[PDB]
Amino acid sequence: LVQKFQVYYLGNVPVAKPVGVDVINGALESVLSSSSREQWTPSHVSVAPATLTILHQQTEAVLGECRVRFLSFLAVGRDVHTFAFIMAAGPASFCCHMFWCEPNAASLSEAVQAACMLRYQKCLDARS
Amino acid sequence: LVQKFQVYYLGNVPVAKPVGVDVINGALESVLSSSSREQWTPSHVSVAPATLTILHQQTEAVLGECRVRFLSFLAVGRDVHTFAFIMAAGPASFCCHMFWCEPNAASLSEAVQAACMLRYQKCLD
């Protein structure tokens, strides 16, 4: 059920806004300008209904865990390999998680979108 | 008896059915994307046994008032912040009022749930 994607985890940075392609592009270029593919942490991203887990490539040790309910934005970068999403870690705290994917990041972004679309809503019939 | 909340009032739209998450999701998408974070009216919601009252946060001007007896459906959206309910607005008409809540819509969803319980208990007499 849960599917895992082989990625380079580029880390997470604080950002100024919860939404925007401008924000995730600037965040990615912060990582790409001072570190190469060799410095990035190879791992897996498991897209579960409630959580995204950044999880090591064979050992299965957790690098980070993000609840889908706090996800505020996601986008593939101007580079088709790069992918990022922003977590609303509170009222003014925003965090941007970044990834590099081979062959590209389209499959991983769609899995995170499906995770954000098929949510359980709380429902109540109040009729007589 | 009351519970009061600081939320954004996204307005109300006519809807096709008295119940439905399909009905409520389409209502929220109509307002979440055709309205911006600044043209959302900051509001004060007063939840009472008989009435839900929606007031402008400062001026306390009336943005809307809904009687609990006509509530037919309640729902939190796919977004945990959003909350909406459907009203019996006419003979065959239906209306959906929508809200955005911080940190989330749980406390507001409970208070409106408590109001419907008082009505459901009032009718069981």
Residue numbers in the entry:
A (entry chain A): 539 to 666
B (entry chain C): 539 to 663
From the article:
Fe65 is a multidomain protein including an N-terminal α-helical domain and three protein-protein interaction modules: a WW domain and two consecutive C-terminal phosphotyrosine-binding (PTB) domains. Fe65 determines localization and nuclear signaling of APP and modulates APP processing and Aβ-peptide generation. Most attention has been given to Fe65-PTB2 as it directly interacts with the AICD and thus functionally joins the two proteins. Here we present structural and functional data on Fe65-PTB2 revealing the domain as flexible module forming a homodimer in vitro and ex vivo in the absence of APP.
Unspecific aggregation of Fe65-PTB2 at concentrations in the mg/mL range can be prevented by the addition of glycerol and we subsequently crystallized the domain and solved its crystal structure by molecular replacement at 2.6 Å resolution. Fe65-PTB2 crystallizes as dimer of dimers with a continuous central β-sheet. Dimerization occurs via a structural transition of the C-terminal α-helix α3 within one Fe65-PTB2 subunit (the “complementing” subunit) in respect to the conformation as seen in the previously solved AICD/Fe65-PTB2 complex. The last two helical turns dissolve (starting at L656) and adopt an extended β-conformation that complements the “accommodating” subunit in trans (dimer interface: 585 Å2). The newly formed β-strand (defined here as βct) quasi-symmetrically mediates also the dimer of dimer contact with the tetrameric assembly being stabilized by a disulfide bridge between respective cysteine (C661) residues. In the crystal structure of the Fe65-PTB2 dimer, the induced strand βct with the C661LD sequence directly matches to the AICD strand. Thus, the complementing Fe65-PTB2 mimics the interacting AICD in space and charge. In summary, Fe65-PTB2 dimerization results in a structural change that blocks the AICD binding site either fundamentally in the accommodating subunit or partially in the complementing subunit. The analysis revealed a pronounced positively charged patch (R605, R607, R657, K660 and R665) in the center of the dimer directly located at the transition site of the C-terminal helix. Most strikingly, in the elongated patch next to the dimer interface we find three adjacent sulfate ions.
